[PDB]
Amino acid sequence: ETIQELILSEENKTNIAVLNLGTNDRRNAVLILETALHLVEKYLGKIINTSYLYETVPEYIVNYINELMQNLEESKYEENKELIDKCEEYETFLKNGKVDNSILKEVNVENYLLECNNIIVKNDEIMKNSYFYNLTVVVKTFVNDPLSMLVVIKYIEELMKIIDIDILFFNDFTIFMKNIKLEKNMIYKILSKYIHLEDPQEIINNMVDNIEFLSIPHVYTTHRYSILLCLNDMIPEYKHNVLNNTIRCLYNKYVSRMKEQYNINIKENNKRIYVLKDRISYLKEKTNIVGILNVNGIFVEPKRAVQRMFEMINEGASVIDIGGESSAPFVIPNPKISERDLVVPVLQLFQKEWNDIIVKCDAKPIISIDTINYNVFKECVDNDLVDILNDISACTNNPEIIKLLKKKNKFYSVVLMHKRGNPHTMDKLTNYDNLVYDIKNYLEQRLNFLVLNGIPRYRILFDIGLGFAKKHDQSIKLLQNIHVYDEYPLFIGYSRKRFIAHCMNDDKDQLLYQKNICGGLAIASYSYYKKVDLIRVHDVLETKSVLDVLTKIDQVKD
Amino acid sequence: QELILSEENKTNIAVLNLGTNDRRNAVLILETALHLVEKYLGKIINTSYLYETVPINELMQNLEESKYEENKELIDKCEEYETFLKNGKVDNSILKEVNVENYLLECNNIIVKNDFYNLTVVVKTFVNDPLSMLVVIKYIEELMIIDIDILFFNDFTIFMKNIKLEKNMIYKILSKYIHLINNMVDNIEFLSIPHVYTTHRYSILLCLNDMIPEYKHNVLNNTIRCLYNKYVSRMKEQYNINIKENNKRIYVLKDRISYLKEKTNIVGILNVNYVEPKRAVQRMFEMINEGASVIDIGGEKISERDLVVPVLQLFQKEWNDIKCDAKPIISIDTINYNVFKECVDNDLVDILNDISACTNNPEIIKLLKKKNKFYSVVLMHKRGNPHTMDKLTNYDNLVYDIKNYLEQRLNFLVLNGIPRYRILFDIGLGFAKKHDQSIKLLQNIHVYDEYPLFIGYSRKRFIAHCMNDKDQLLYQKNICGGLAIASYSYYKKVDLIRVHDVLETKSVLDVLTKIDQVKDPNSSSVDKLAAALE
């Protein structure tokens, strides 16, 4: 073993890798980055963190996808979708603690900086001769070393044929290898260790020329805003030995320096993205209406419900939230009929009736299902009936449902809502030490749990659960302080809740029904100025009319 | 003797300050004072806003009438006033007149020794000299609690250090201007013009900046505006305080204080064109119960007088079937002098809503003043009539043309002794405005931040322009889109909004008011720090 002593070593280890994923195809960004995300889970190890998606300014200065997915070679390492609460190796990575010794030879901090600076200054005047879509992931990887991992990454880039995947960190290592040449047989041997290889011929041809040197950290880690922007979401307290500071301090200095040194305000043109289904949404650029479809006095027939769905589409709802449970305080569900029996038939009919399309392939509303029950969501998702899980337990009731959010090539988005107890008990469970931050921190802990378990950060929506184990003054208090969610994708449901009525001064009890809907439009307005991303409403047309007037008043004509 | 008694009746420009300490009756105390000024001194040709600052039913039928005669006729120019402002030649000072340093040294002598509801006025006065006026002013003070002071009198730099005037001399000045004294002697120690604290009390500079920003007395170092601006500059830099917070600008809809920009009042629309006056008066009570602060009645073959006076009279009677007083302010949507005169003589209305901005018949302004009473007015911008206005939409500068129009218009009413704090501005949405221009007026509503603003979007056609069986659908969207403008108006602090759908508007404003009522306005950063520390 001249080259293969330790590189091909049978002794299996667990490393932490931090990757950067980039594309400049805006229209296909989500499909390309998430196809890269699936090849990372498949070939490199386990995804235990992701940044938001960003639309980023170029910083040079400083459906064959669908075909491919049916024809992939099998990893020699097993998938494990089982939930985890902890990852020790990742704990160790973050404290810069004692991971295993590098099989690739390390440089010291001063040599690293010398060689890093040389690549950039040489890369600057080479460059002196569209938007980016960026994402970072932390991977718990079975790959033995960064060079091994770069070889597998370049294979992933080749399968995909558009995509840049870089290694930013690998363990606490500092590495600068200058004139790497791996023979084609050596590349095959490294791929074979991680993959059951079966047109992977000309691919090995390509890769020999392409792996020229190996920098860990990445040279541009510290020099691109787009990279620090992403790392700041995942690992802000991280300090590599080669960095003047923690990633958050590096991120903050960069933002500041652009203000004071150039008067730029760099956030304006590097935009945070959340994904509801398969398309980019710019965080805080739009208040989408989520139309409520309660399939539950009882016996809501599927035909009636589906025509309500079509009504709500025409009234301007961009999302439909269907549910067969009832969450009102002090009530129990319908006599016999099961949750699945209420929602699946409705959804199956809707899906058929929409398929009688004419030809608007992007006037289709996103479907959200309000369920905490695995069996219902499992059936909805297998039968392509829903896009979004609306879990009012924040996946707490049965965290197994988190496994259903990851299909082989698909990812589903999810709303995490705060409540305490159940409908009968929740009006009792009203004591908070720090209401606003208690609830915010709960949702942040839930998101960390999903993200640790491989759910993309940008597919996760926060919801404060207004009226769920909150007094009316507490529901109000969370709306007063909603700015607390300014960095995050936000979903709220005020519609027709008792607290609205508590705000009002003082036909037969239907005068209170009217003031309640009219009071909700006040909140729709408030939400609009607070740039709330989604509002769950019963009254789609009334809310739509309000958001259109407010939108028009904001648009300056020329 | 002295020239003081000179029988001749030539005209001087006098700037007064008016103060009271009563909160509720401040209007009645200050407006009663404006009338007595008007009656015994000459003509009110300017007033400021009423400001709250951080430092009689019987009397009006038992009036000693004046030796002069009040000309109610409208004016558009005042030569004496225009000369006063440039400090041009005026009939020379009949009193002993000191110079700059002798005034400052003596001024300083009063400040260093003796170490709230404000309203300035300007008066074209027949009175010969400030001393004579201060006898009338003080005599007036004694009939009414109230401190009336002379800020200026022509360009005069008067200082008179000791003053004793025997009862016989006071009777002869009061008799000169009045068909008829104890304390004037005990109370009139000296005379300073300009008044000593002119350039010191913020409450005084604040009021003068409303009336005469570009006035420059040679005693003062700068124009009233630059002295005013520099002070606001100092209070922020040195003490790090916004002076506005506690010194609040006031407007008046009837007889009570309204803090400018602190509430969005609902004005409920009663169009008695769509009758049974019993139905319409039912609708007025309905609207009061749905939350209308104000009712705006209008009629426009049977006359508008026969459509609206019966209704207002039935109403005012049905309100007598109440044997406390959360009573609605009444607005009449008329440009007809005669219709407003009837209503005002029968005490059926508090406000003139004139959509011609008092341009159909400027004489209507004469009805906003009485012997004692004052009525407030809404001045709306439009062009043409309902048949022609949709084509009258070309403007040099849409936003500023309409502002300057309403500002020229307020200058006219104020020149004619209408109190500035009773004049509400309305941009007239949808009147000689394209839908995009109605929007642009709303987008630029901040341009009325200093002024009482009254707007009417309700059910207008531009709302529909904002939006993407079928007829009843457009009508519902129109009411719903209006609730967005109520929301916008609430956040832009629009003082009044004229709406058809009171209940819906009231629902919205209650919810928005609640979201804004923060128990502890430090809690957001406190609570955040707590969480960072836990």
Ligand SMILES: Nc1nc2c(c(=O)[nH]1)N=C(CNc1ccc(S(=O)(=O)Nc3nccs3)cc1)CN2
């Ligand atoms: N993401 C998300 N999903 C939802 C939500 C929601 O807010 N967010 N709300 C309901 C409806 N549940 C509910 C309805 C009314 C009240 S309440 O406010 O009207 N009743 C009471 N609140 C406090 C004391 S009694 C509470 C919960 C169903 N699904």
Ligand SMILES: Nc1nc2c(c(=O)[nH]1)N=C(CNc1ccc(S(=O)(=O)Nc3nccs3)cc1)CN2
């Ligand atoms: N202070 C005050 N008083 C008013 C106001 C107002 O805005 N302010 N508006 C009307 C109602 N005027 C009106 C109604 C509808 C339209 S429109 O937008 O629907 N367009 C029309 N174009 C031609 C005839 S009606 C325009 C004006 C009556 N009185």
Ligand SMILES: Nc1ncnc2c1ncn2[C@@H]1O[C@H](COP(=O)(O)O)[C@@H](O)[C@H]1O
């Ligand atoms: N940490 C790293 N991640 C990815 N490529 C790296 C790294 N360090 C050096 N490289 C080299 O950078 C080149 C890839 O550039 P690019 O084509 O822009 O992705 C190849 O020669 C890689 O060997």
Ligand SMILES: Nc1ncnc2c1ncn2[C@@H]1O[C@H](COP(=O)(O)O)[C@@H](O)[C@H]1O
């Ligand atoms: N410009 C002035 N206006 C009114 N009173 C003045 C003026 N200059 C001096 N005084 C005298 O100062 C007193 C002010 O009393 P006070 O109301 O406490 O400010 C009056 O009684 C007058 O005799």
Ligand SMILES: Nc1nc2c(c(=O)[nH]1)N=C(CO)CN2
């Ligand atoms: N914002 C941004 N700039 C770049 C990126 C990138 O991914 N994002 N990648 C580059 C080389 O592929 C060059 N510059």
Ligand SMILES: [Ca+2]
């Ligand atoms: Ca995996």
Ligand SMILES: [Ca+2]
């Ligand atoms: Ca007079």
Ligand SMILES: [Mg+2]
């Ligand atoms: Mg690269």
Ligand SMILES: [Mg+2]
């Ligand atoms: Mg005084």
